[PDB]
Amino acid sequence: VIHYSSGKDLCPVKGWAPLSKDNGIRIGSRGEVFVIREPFISCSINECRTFFLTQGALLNDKHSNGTVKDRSPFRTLMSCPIGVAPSPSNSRFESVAWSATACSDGPGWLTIGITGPDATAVAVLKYNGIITDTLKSWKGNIMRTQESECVCQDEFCYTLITDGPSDAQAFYKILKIKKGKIVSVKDVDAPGFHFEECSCYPSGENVECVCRDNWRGSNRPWIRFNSDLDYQIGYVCSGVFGDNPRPMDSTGSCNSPINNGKGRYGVKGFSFRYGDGVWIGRTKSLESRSGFEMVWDANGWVSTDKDSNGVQDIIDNDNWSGYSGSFSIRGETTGRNCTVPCFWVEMIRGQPKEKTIWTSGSSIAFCGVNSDTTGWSWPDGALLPFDI
Amino acid sequence: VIHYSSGKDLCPVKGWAPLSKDNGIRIGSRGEVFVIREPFISCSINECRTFFLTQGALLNDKHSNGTVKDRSPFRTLMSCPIGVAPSPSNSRFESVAWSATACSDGPGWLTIGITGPDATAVAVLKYNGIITDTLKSWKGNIMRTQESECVCQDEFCYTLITDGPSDAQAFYKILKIKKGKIVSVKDVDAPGFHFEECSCYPSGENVECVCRDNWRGSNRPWIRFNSDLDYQIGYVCSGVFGDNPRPMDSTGSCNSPINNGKGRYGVKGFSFRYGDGVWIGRTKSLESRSGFEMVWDANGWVSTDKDSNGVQDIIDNDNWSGYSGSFSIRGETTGRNCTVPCFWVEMIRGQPKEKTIWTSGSSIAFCGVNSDTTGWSWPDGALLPFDI
Amino acid sequence: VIHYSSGKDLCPVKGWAPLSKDNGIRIGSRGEVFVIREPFISCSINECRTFFLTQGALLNDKHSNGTVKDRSPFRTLMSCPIGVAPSPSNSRFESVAWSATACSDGPGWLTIGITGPDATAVAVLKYNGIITDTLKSWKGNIMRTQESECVCQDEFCYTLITDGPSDAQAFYKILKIKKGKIVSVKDVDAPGFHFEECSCYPSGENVECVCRDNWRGSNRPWIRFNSDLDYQIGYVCSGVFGDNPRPMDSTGSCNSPINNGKGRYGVKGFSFRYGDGVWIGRTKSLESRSGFEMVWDANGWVSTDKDSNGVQDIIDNDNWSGYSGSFSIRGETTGRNCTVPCFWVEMIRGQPKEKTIWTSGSSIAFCGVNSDTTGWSWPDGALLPFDI
Amino acid sequence: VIHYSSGKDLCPVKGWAPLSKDNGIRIGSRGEVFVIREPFISCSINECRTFFLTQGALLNDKHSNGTVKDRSPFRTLMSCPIGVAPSPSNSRFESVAWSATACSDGPGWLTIGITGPDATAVAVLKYNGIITDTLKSWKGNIMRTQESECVCQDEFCYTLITDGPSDAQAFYKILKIKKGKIVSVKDVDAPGFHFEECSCYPSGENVECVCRDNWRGSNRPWIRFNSDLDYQIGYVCSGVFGDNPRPMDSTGSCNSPINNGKGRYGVKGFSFRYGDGVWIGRTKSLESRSGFEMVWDANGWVSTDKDSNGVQDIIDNDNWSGYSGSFSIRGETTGRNCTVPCFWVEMIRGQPKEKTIWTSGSSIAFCGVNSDTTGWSWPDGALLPFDI
Numbered sequence A, B, C, D: 001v002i003h004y005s006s007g008k009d010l011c012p013v014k015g016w017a018p019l020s021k022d023n024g025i026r027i028g029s030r031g032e033v034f035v036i037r038e039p040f041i042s043c044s045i046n047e048c049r050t051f052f053l054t055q056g057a058l059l060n061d062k063h064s065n066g067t068v069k070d071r072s073p074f075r076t077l078m079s080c081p082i083g084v085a086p087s088p089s090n091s092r093f094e095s096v097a098w099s100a101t102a103c104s105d106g107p108g109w110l111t112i113g114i115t116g117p118d119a120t121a122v123a124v125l126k127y128n129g130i131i132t133d134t135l136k137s138w139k140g141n142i143m144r145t146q147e148s149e150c151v152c153q154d155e156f157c158y159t160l161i162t163d164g165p166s167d168a169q170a171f172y173k174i175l176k177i178k179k180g181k182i183v184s185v186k187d188v189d190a191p192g193f194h195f196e197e198c199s200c201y202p203s204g205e206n207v208e209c210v211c212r213d214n215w216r217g218s219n220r221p222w223i224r225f226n227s228d229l230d231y232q233i234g235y236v237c238s239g240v241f242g243d244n245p246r247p248m249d250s251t252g253s254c255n256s257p258i259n260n261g262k263g264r265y266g267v268k269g270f271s272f273r274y275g276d277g278v279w280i281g282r283t284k285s286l287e288s289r290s291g292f293e294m295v296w297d298a299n300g301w302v303s304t305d306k307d308s309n310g311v312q313d314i315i316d317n318d319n320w321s322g323y324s325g326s327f328s329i330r331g332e333t334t335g336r337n338c339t340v341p342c343f344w345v346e347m348i349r350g351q352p353k354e355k356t357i358w359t360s361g362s363s364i365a366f367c368g369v370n371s372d373t374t375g376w377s378w379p380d381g382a383l384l385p386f387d388i
């Protein structure tokens, strides 16, 4: 009934409480579940949904052969309430795409599915199901967006789309949609920044996004912008390196990509800035995508220290992990006066790691809570391989 | 809450954006999906549904043996939201029939399922589930309707039903239903016109329908009628032949069926008239039903030229295609002031082409959008045959 | 929002139009469908549902072994919208029982599931899910009710429950429930009447029910009662014998059971009285339950003639049939001023007839319609046996 | 629309009527059903749901190997309407936990899922899906709650959480939540009381809970508390011993745990106090968890007699049983002026008893009803083992 308003700070967060695990892949052992990847959560006022880029096939099937590759005319974005296995039975259709992002402005959903050829892909802006606008690749190299939730404030929604090479320098645009209508955009001038798959969240008029450098950064690049899109960038000061792969935590930088041989690649991640401090979600292995923890250098957003301030384990480094996102839960839903930060973790299974013919993922998600919390490990839990 | 009103022109269309693909058949590889064929989309104010003539069985089953033939006491029309696999779980029942058409007048659905013996079939008019009227075959040779969406304007809905031989001359009626009540009908006087499986859409008081000549036309027959049903017919002037099979594009006619040896048969198709121009959806092969593109002779509706004005590829001619429809999205849904034309393509799989014991189809759908667009190929994607 | 009112005559009925077929069993070939039997339809103002007595198992399963017998602590009554396969996915729970009846008073559903031991069974009155009342067997021999829809008028609902031997004389009660509360009941004094599994329908203050004599009647016993329950009985005058088994149509009686060797048994059936005439639904075989047609002696309700007045075939006698019911569609739903009579036919498959380890059923349903109609045969369509 | 109010007595109960059986496990024979355990019902004003602690896998699957053990990062609490098989298709997600309790305050649901390591588990308070509060283990030994429904009165909800050894003395807290916000708590001082898995219900300002002594009680411990939490404890006076295992009914105590060699263990149970009398639900075997009946010593709550006053059989001791719960149905739903007591019985299948690699459970539930009733046996009904 009412729109998500602006001007609200990320509530106090002492520990992450488990919101929901979905055993997607475990149920797919013998159930009718979609082969997935690239999942992420997003809430509106009443319903919180899990979105995902379907490989257009179900687990334990001959059509799941090769689900290791991203992009195909088959890849389709779809939603489902949190915690439930994403099956053709509860899965609602959202868009045709192999990369995308969706958010809500409160009472309605915005869906940005980017499908089409590598050479000249197209974003398709849908609002509550209806196509409302489009955007075509401008640099001609895999236009691609967040692969996570976008943020909306006062009728207006924001996101970020990259387009360039994975190799080195690419190009970045900030959109400002309103009812699915692209009402403006700015070309970000970030020399030496590889920006892509951003994990955003609103923070008082502003919109803060921590993303990934898949060019030469072992730390994360960030970007905070206006209602008009006047930006501000750099990387996360902290030495508790978030990317992956990443080197042993050294002294970090706050404006350049810390290479250290490992920077060269990366994986989607998030982070919440709390003043001078910042909560950092990161994998435990430094070479592979396994395990997952939520750090806490309180000097983190401004200091290059490597000294952290406390860790809550989420997945021991004995199990697999993957894409880490970061949606938010507004104060229109919560009787509260501050936005609640929450995050979900994708546990990838199958290739290129495990000896299977398929590659999909599971998921879990925790929230803010300024109460008590315990750590652990809530992995996928699939006994692999399958009836392959 | 409000009725679909009349007097609205097909919005400006620069390129077709992908609305939704459903991997129906791919999910049926191991999922619980209905063996289908004859699908088509249709929207109302809130929900857009996909309708289809079920073979009364599920894919990869012994009861899917022979799904190649149309018509049976088993064939049943059913709906489901767009993009989702049409399974016994999300599929809603609509009518008993092996041919039909359904539309909305805005707040409610109209369903016309025609079932019964070849010799004396019956149409059954249901409105929001309730039987409201009926119509029996009058010429005694497979009464059959659109096999696509019908159009409604100002409480009143319109459709077209054929009844005659596939061989040559058949007979055609224009209905005018209101709340499922057949409030009038006209016998179309079209000497030398094989009219059937019409793809309609509203265009300002009027109702334009491009159909198929399965008698001796390699081009498409059309028909525009009133609120009172005073019609106007002929074929599409353009030389960019729409039927299939069809001969190489020669100089076309605008009132007679261009035979050229191939005319003899055909397949359902659509087309949107934009003044002197017209958007033409057609298969790439000329002998088989494979591939699919959306043409654009701007002189097309009035000129017999074969010179076209631009092509957006939808399915390379390397994959299968099939029935091509053409629903519309009114301006009551879209805040806009003009109806948005959209179309769906059926990709048929199995017989009579492929070495299987079954025959079903998948689907995709794109919309207007006066923005940018890219072409490609979004085929079914089923690795055939099956566990047959 | 409004209650089903009384005082309305069964609309004019020229022919039966097909409302819905569900290929229950055909989809169960490989789908997740419930092993059923004893189905029947029932509508309320918005939704029409199909109810059924589940064998507490799914088709093609080892737990479907013996589904030939009625009654078990497993048998559970459940609903689902018309036309859809009754699967654990769309099937809504209704009650624990191996015999029952449910109806609506317009805005709410009444459910009467009778479960428990043969010796001392209990009816359980639930209204919109909540238990509201109960009734225990009074004669101690399988208390059992309609096994079809009951009728409600002006806040009040009515049904019929038998209790006695199948062998000969049993006992019958007429209930009068209101919001699931049994507000009165009468003991029917029908010497020489075997009354059970009644197919009812409202007809102007009154409630007419045609049932079955499984004692010594080859024709059907009827019963019309008041708002206070003052009854009137006898059998259907007509010579077009409805029971099954039944002898060749001879001259019938209107108050006694016509034995003729075959009377001894029977199967549920229905019939609609239209003044002096009456529509009769009956099987084609006289020894088995196969085929199904809808007769029409217009002198039928009062005359003992065997001369009929027209037949619409529903299922050739080459396929199986079974329980035949008879719900109604009120005028609160239909803008009309008269109730619309409709009926559903159960096609039983498996034992004791076919060489299977299971026994379930499918269904179809047609309605009034004072328009044109065609006959045919819309059988189950299952290729048996199964993966048994 | 309106909150569940307080001050209402458990309506008169002559016999238990069957509300719903779900053949969970039987449908899982070949259906897509969740491997479950720890189920229990809970109603709100409109919908009654069944909740359960999923083993994060489906029956007849390799991932159901070991479902015999409680607790795992996979165990997740989920709901579904009563009577339906708890499958990934109708099962709604509720929380991440291997122990929990949920209730309604009328218009909304409260969910308390306790997940995490044995050493330091955490309760997570969610209200209508949103995390609203948390509580961490305080004694560091499997914090665990009711494993059944909690009670809410006048905006406020109540429950009970244990934390200590199964061996002997543990510790107990009474919570008082309001909109998921823990607004107070009391540490129960029960020397010599093993309190856990309480079966509660409201009874006029007060909240009565009968639980289980898994330390040295063969009878059940109880606890009645205020709006402020001023408690009162002891055990059930009656000699008709409720725990299990339990010794032959001797003369009972009303404040201490009756050991008798068997007390040492136990299984969840319930009981409703009706003045000086009390309805007792208990297993028939004394060593195993098989069969189930509902006793009635009318002198029971105050007298140590072993003389009972009537038994209604629920499951002969030839079949398996398990956890027995006890939710309630308020008078806001029932037009009535008194709360209706109802109970559900879990029939466990598989290990440690049966020769299977899995362990799950089915369920049934009956209600108050001051009418007639019959006894019987409505067991799971699964033919074991499975395709194991």
Ligand SMILES: CC(=O)N[C@H]1[C@H]([C@H](O)[C@H](O)CO)OC(C(=O)O)=C[C@@H]1O
Residues within 6 Å of the ligand: A038, A070, A071, A098, A099, A142, A143, A144, A165, A166, A196, A197, A214, A267
């Ligand atoms: C649009 C697209 O292909 N995104 C892909 C992304 C991308 O290649 C990289 O960020 C360089 O731009 O990488 C990965 C990956 O984790 O292997 C999966 C994504 O689907």
Ligand SMILES: CC(=O)N[C@H]1[C@H]([C@H](O)[C@H](O)CO)OC(C(=O)O)=C[C@@H]1O
Residues within 6 Å of the ligand: B038, B070, B071, B098, B099, B142, B143, B144, B165, B166, B196, B197, B214, B267
């Ligand atoms: C009612 C009916 O049978 N329609 C059929 C239609 C028809 O035969 C033809 O248009 C000549 O009238 O052809 C085809 C077809 O593409 O093979 C499938 C349809 O189901």
Ligand SMILES: CC(=O)N[C@H]1[C@H]([C@H](O)[C@H](O)CO)OC(C(=O)O)=C[C@@H]1O
Residues within 6 Å of the ligand: C038, C070, C071, C098, C099, C142, C143, C144, C165, C166, C196, C197, C214, C267
């Ligand atoms: C309650 C019950 O068992 N009803 C059964 C009914 C009954 O035995 C008969 O009407 C004599 O009373 O017969 C049949 C039947 O068609 O074989 C199935 C029913 O389930």
Ligand SMILES: CC(=O)N[C@H]1[C@H]([C@H](O)[C@H](O)CO)OC(C(=O)O)=C[C@@H]1O
Residues within 6 Å of the ligand: D038, D070, D071, D098, D099, D142, D143, D144, D165, D166, D196, D197, D214, D267
């Ligand atoms: C949190 C937890 O593990 N609860 C378990 C409970 C518990 O161990 C016992 O009550 C001693 O505290 O016992 C049992 C059981 O019937 O075998 C299953 C429960 O899941």
